[PDB]
Amino acid sequence: VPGFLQQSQNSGPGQPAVWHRLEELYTKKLWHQLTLQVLDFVQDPCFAQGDGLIKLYENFISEFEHRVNPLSLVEIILHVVRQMTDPNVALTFLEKTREKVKSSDEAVILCKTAIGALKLNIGDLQVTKETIEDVEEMLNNLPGVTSVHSRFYDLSSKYYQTIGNHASYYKDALRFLGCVDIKDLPVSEQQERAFTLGLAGLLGEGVFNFGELLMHPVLESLRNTDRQWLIDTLYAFNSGNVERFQTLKTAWGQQPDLAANEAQLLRKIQLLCLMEMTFTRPANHRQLTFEEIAKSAKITVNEVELLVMKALSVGLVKGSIDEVDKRVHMTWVQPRVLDLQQIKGMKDRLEFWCTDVKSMEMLVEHQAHDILT
């Protein structure tokens, strides 16, 4: 049964010394310590492309798989099935893989992630959705975050990208960037992921919190990249500068998706312009004339009301519309990310508030000193 190992000992696809080390680990029965060497060799810089490592599965790991860590047993099979390319039999391969590792729920999560990615490759979105909705429920039961979360988030983000659901794609890409250190990822991968995350944030439905996105370190990978315009576009979305958006059209129209959904982008940036307009004015002067909104949002006056409707319906702002006087009484804004200087101004407001509270407390204590208990 170990005849394959002895064969590779002398005439091996890889380095015979590596097979000798594997043989020594097997003889010493350092099975888990054999798993690290197996992980090091499976991602072979020599014969990862060759199909020989496929017979590594049946000949080598299938014999001792009964006492391998299921989570450490599964990702080896990931690169094992990477070599093979036949679609349908891969499903049976991973089905048997899922069957054998049943004690560790993380192993099941990883196996379902692999089958979901492969079924996404073949274009079976309908069953991929069911697999995703099951593995998501199983992942919620798992406490904390582990190494299997990133694969799930990548698979689900790719699924929503293939469907085109920008909002859910942005949501899940944020999680994926949250469970993985960005320093580990390649610069090309970081740049591509930042570009797609910004694209989804622009094109997502209900994605209005651009201040938090602007502070994401992933976007820092595009500071000097030619896609820096995207960051600028996000800036135009953060401040609600529709004029900046129209000026940057010459850059963002070259992207096919932004060119296709320029109308939705304009509506979103008009809503954000409304948010910025209400945010800038102090609470005593939050009565925006129809002319002000029409001029700031680059829209006609007769459309302004409808715009406010959207901002009122989504929940971005609160208030009312006095169409007789052509005014909008705004009373509440969606809270936004504030700069350090804005935080200092807020602290100064708190200083004045504390002074008033202390003064009135001392007044009440002094006036009612005799009756105070």
Place this chain on the structure above:
Amino acid sequence: LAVQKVVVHPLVLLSVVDHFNRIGKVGNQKRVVGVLLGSWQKKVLDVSNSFAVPFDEDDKDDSVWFLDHDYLENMYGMFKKVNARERIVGWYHTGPKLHKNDIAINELMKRYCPNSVLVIIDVKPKDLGLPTEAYISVEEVHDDGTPTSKTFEHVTSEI
């Protein structure tokens, strides 16, 4: 949430103060930890009794801490014999503020009571606030993409 209000009886306060004093008679301690027993009335907790459990921790490292859970179970049985309607509803400690390892201790306590409540009872006589501050463990789902963690959501506490 699962908890709307936590009512801490004066007996609990006196027991916590006595536990803190008798342990601090050794002259080398920071806080003491015990188990809270009470009943459930609608969504209002009724913390009514408590008992001390052995507990220690490292001053520098927060991951090093020992709690005698066997002692917890044995005294739970002893108290249940006296009063069957008083069940474990959480725990307490006398540290003036929260601790980084409080989440781990709440995870340990959650086995005995799934919706465990941690009532930080400040022995020092604060002039304004109540000596009790109640918290319940929740899974905070952040919208920044950061992975979901366990935090302590505050609960209105009354005496």
Place this chain on the structure above:
Amino acid sequence: VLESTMVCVDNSEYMRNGDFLPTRLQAQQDAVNIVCHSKTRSNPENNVGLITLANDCEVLTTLTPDTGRILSKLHTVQPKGKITFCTGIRVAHLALKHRQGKNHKMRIIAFVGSPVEDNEKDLVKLAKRLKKEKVNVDIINFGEEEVNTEKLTAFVNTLNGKDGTGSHLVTVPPGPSLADALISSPILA
């Protein structure tokens, strides 16, 4: 003697290896069963308890004059995580500081079967701290002794100082069963 002991069993990944027949986990289970029985018949008032040495330390059972519950706890012990020897010893010491009877003597059984990923300075300072409180930690150097034979050497030398065999560093090379080497070791003598 009237002493209390707390076994620092290891449930790291490397316990899945078949170096010790049948598995290192079952081998340490038998070794724990033997050592707890030995401490029980040494003195009926002796106290034994189980502290795991997983990725994060977890006191499975505190000190108790009972034996079967220790093996009941060990039965459910699955191999998971990486050894954390620094925190495990201090957690065990905290447990011994709160024994039922303070007249008992300090004792910790350490089952190291994975490399200790710490600097020697931390180990020697821990050994000095334990020596100050008259804490004796007996370490079984099975598993990866080819790399841990130096750190544990300094640990035991600093713990025992220059006089008195308070703690031992019984190193069991891989074989049929490390428990079969325990009954000849000074741990059970």
